[PDB]
Design a protein around this ligand. Structure first.
Ligand SMILES: CC(=O)N[C@@H]1[C@@H](O)[C@H](O[C@@H]2O[C@H](CO)[C@@H](O)[C@H](O)[C@H]2NC(C)=O)[C@@H](CO)O[C@H]1O
Length: 326
């Protein structure tokens, strides 16, 4: 797996941007996050059927991409997905259903993209030792699934900012709720790409409020994971830095890909990237924690491959060229 990646979400559905068959996806994407595995009534058995092709056709298309060095990952959740693991029985249905899908289609890994049903209960105060069943069981399930496959099994996640960087402000309910998940699976985590969009403002480690879709915001939010940060206003409760090679930034491919804002122009984003990766500043207000950069910063994720194709391939062309050209 390359050192500077483009990870793109792939719509297993037509939302007006159309379907792109797998072999027609631009080769500039290194990893394709197939979107999404969702659930029915029991909210724990994950299901997936391809939007085009026989099952065998879809599996063959995945095999073709893998033969070209690409990774194809099953994303679980999304805007509409609901996964609830209140007890061990539910956890086991989740594990078995996902393993079955990985086996059936030959997915290279899984992406945790759960955007509901995740809360730190009252008294759940320690990110190293979570107590809320949903969180404890997700961690257990993720570790179990990862340990069911070989060394190249890919694990990613795409939490919204409140769940991660929001932990700088509060630790409870959704605030910081992915922190125990991240920590609990860190030794199996390939990378995390927080969604830096549909996100309003975010507080940086300088205590300043930043607006989504600005270079300063991208640097401030990424730096939290690159450097680590105190949780919930408690100086003695530090969330440790991830490896730089585990940190990505998730961005909208086009303005319309994130209807509540967050899109950033490649010109502005390259300022943020040069600062993050090389410590080369751009006159921004945010001061990077390590002023000579985090060279192993892993790259960019986008919602989505489909949106990118409808927007002159702006995201894929701009950022592939940027990363290739370093
Ligand atoms: C990274 C990620 O998965 N983001 C979430 C997406 O699911 C969401 O896109 C929306 O997904 C729905 C299915 O879950 C689609 O029905 C819907 O059309 C789609 N919205 C758009 C504008 O493409 C994106 C939207 O920015 O953010 C998260 O909510």
């Amino acid at each position: 797996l390359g050192s500077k990646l483009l990870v793109g979400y792939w719509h297993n559905f037509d939302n007006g941007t159309g379907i792109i068959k797998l072999k027609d996806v631009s080769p500039k994407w290194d990893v394709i996050n197939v979107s999404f595995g969702e659930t029915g009534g029991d909210r724990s058995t994950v299901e997936f059927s391809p939007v085009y092709g026989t099952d065998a056709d879809f599996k063959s298309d995945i095999s073709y991409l893998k033969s070209k060095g690409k990774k194809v990952v099953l994303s679980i959740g999304g805007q509409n997905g609901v996964v609830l693991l209140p007890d061990n029985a539910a956890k086991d249905r989740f594990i078995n259903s996902i393993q079955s899908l990985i086996d059936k289609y030959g997915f290279d890994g899984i992406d945790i993209d759960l955007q509901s049903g995740i809360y730190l209960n009252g008294n759940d105060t320690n990110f190293k030792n979570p107590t809320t069943p949903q969180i404890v069981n997700l961690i257990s399930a993720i570790r179990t699934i990862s340990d069911h496959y070989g060394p190249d099994f890919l694990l990613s996640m795409a939490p919204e900012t409140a769940y991660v960087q929001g932990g700088y402000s509060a630790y409870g309910s959704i605030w910081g709720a992915y922190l125990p998940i991240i920590y609990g699976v860190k030794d199996k985590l390939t990378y995390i790409h927080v969604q830096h969009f549909n996100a309003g403002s975010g507080i940086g480690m300088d205590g300043n409020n930043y607006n989504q879709g600005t270079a300063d915001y991208e640097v401030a939010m990424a730096d939290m994971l690159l450097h680590g940060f105190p949780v919930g206003g408690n100086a003695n409760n530090i969330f440790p830095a991830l490896r730089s090679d585990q940190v990505m930034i998730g961005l909208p491919a086009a303005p319309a890909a994130a209807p509540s804002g967050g899109y950033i122009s490649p010109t502005e984003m390259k300022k943020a990237l040069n600062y993050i990766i090389k410590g080369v500043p751009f006159g921004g207000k945010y001061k990077l924690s390590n002023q000579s950069g985090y060279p192993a910063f892993r790259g960019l994720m986008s919602w989505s491959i489909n949106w990118d194709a409808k927007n002159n391939f702006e995201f894929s062309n701009n950022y592939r060229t940027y990363f290739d050209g370093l």
